[PDB]
């Protein structure tokens, strides 16, 4: 794949061609869009050192994340008391999730599913509960409904994946499973990622409700009554919401990536905990605080990084580049050129 400059004559016949990448004179010809070059110095292209090799540096962690307990639990929590589990200090292989079942929902916000294995996360959190199938739509940012309003609210700027699958086999009983509860009455809508387990009677009316359970006085929690016979919309669905923080930091959770050796003073492609770039890594005198894992310049570009294995500060410098100018006496005079 090459760029050519073709001279079509009066009859449409290509009578000559210039290979733009052959030599500096042809590059000048292509930049000037002419087969003749006058005397002068012409800016043609940009010199750039290309990366010799690719380096990957990921934390020296091998133990897999406890996704098995999160997804293969015998009984999930109720939506009003949704369970939050901390996923940290482990390799997170998201490929195991796909194989389990034909998921009803594996919808990701702020990320793509296929790239989850290529990223590092500061502290993953899995929120698990059981809802009705028709309520599965309410598990999303900026949604309206009983589950979203009074049980589990996702933030508008939510970064993470919601995974919902049918649990009719494990959560439906012929007589009816009343274990799972949802909050139906609350004074105000829950703020995102907040749990209300209070069982105080809801006072819709003016008259007090001290357990009276009368009109306008109701117990906030209500049962689900899952049964196998009911349709898919009424069948129970198990939902796990994975919430992770993508802005780079000391990353406890990382994907299954095999780290290469750290090579300095050479222009290399580099991947530090999901941060990908091209540059020369060199020893740095910058002193990083323990929470600080990388440094940014005035353009919010990473100019210093901390090695996940050795905890060594490395300056990142762009690989050498510049402009290329072709000094030519003129194609009439000679085909010799000089390169600046």
């Amino acid at each position, epitope marked *: 794949p090459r760029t050519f400059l073709l001279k079509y004559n009066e009859n449409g016949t290509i009578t000559d061609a210039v290979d733009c990448a052959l030599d500096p004179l042809s590059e000048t010809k292509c930049t000037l869009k002419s087969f003749t070059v006058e005397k002068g110095i012409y800016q043609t292209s940009n010199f750039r050192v290309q990366p010799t090799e690719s380096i990957v540096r990921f934390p020296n962690i091998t133990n897999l994340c406890p996704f098995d307990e999160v997804f293969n639990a015998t009984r999930f929590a109720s939506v009003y008391a949704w369970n939050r589990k901390r996923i940290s200090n482990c390799v997170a292989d998201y490929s195991v999730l796909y194989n389990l079942a034909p998921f009803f929902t594996f919808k990701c916000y702020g990320v793509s599913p296929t790239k989850l294995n290529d990223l590092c996360f500061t502290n993953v959190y899995a929120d698990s509960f059981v809802i009705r199938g028709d309520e599965v739509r309410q598990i999303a940012p900026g949604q309206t409904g009983n589950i979203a309003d009074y049980n589990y609210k996702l933030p508008d700027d939510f970064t993470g994946c919601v995974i919902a699958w049918n649990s009719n086999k494990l959560d439906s009983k012929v007589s009816g499973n009343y274990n799972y509860l949802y909050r139906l009455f609350r004074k105000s809508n829950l703020k995102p990622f907040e749990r209300d387990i209070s069982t105080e009677i809801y006072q819709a009316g003016n008259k007090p409700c001290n357990g009276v359970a009368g009109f306008n006085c109701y117990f906030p929690l209500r049962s689900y009554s899952f049964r196998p016979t009911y*349709g898919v919309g009424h069948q129970p669905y198990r939902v796990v919401v994975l919430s992770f923080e993508l802005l780079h930091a000391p990353a406890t959770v990382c994907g299954p990536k095999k780290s290469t050796n750290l090579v300095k003073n050479k222009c290399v492609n580099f991947n530090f905990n999901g941060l990908k770039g091209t540059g020369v890594l060199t020893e740095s005198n910058k002193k990083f605080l323990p929470f600080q894992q990388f440094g940014r310049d005035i353009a919010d570009t990473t100019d210093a990084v901390r090695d996940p294995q050795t905890l060594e500060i490395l300056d990142i410098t762009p690989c050498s580049f510049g402009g290329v100018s072709v000094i030519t006496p003129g194609t009439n005079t000679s085909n010799q050129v000089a390169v600046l």
Partner: antibody
Amino acid sequence: VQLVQSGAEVKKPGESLKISCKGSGYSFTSYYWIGWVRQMPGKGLEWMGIVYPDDSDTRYSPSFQGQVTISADKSISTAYLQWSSLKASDTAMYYCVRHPGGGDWYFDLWGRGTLVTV
Amino acid sequence: DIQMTQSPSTLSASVGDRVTITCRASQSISSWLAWYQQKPGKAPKLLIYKASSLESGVPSRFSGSGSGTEFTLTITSLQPDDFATYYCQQYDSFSWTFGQGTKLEI
């Protein structure tokens, strides 16, 4: 193409009453709406409710809603009319009825009947 | 809840006569009335659906007509088995309602 209902039975007030209707002679039994109609002694028919056996969806008349519970066991092609708190007003003879699909919502098939006297 | 009034409540006609029964609707239904034969101690059997077409196994003597609020059921020539209760029910909208019923005597 018949609907066989449970035998007529007599029960005292306050007891749980279950009436069974099994459909035979037609295929795709789960895809036919099956309902119950009440006839009081010396009174006209009153439609009570219908169920879709495949998905167990239930529709009820406003008068009988909550008072009755109508269920469908699709596995054995059966529909059950369940009454709680039997009372004197709960004395009538009940028909299991079948609905055609689409926009035809008459009762093409009627069961023999199930008298219940309290 | 569409209300159906069936007139007359009881009718007596000699065998072989032509008998007419009127079913009146609280609100108009677009030809969604069904006519049933209920003999004493028996299951109502569908005669007429859509108020025009008749069910299989029903002789041509039984007939139906009408539209909107007013519908009619007519027997041209009576038979001994013909005399029994007759019902009209709308199926235009849910919460289906039956007529009171007409008892036929010789």
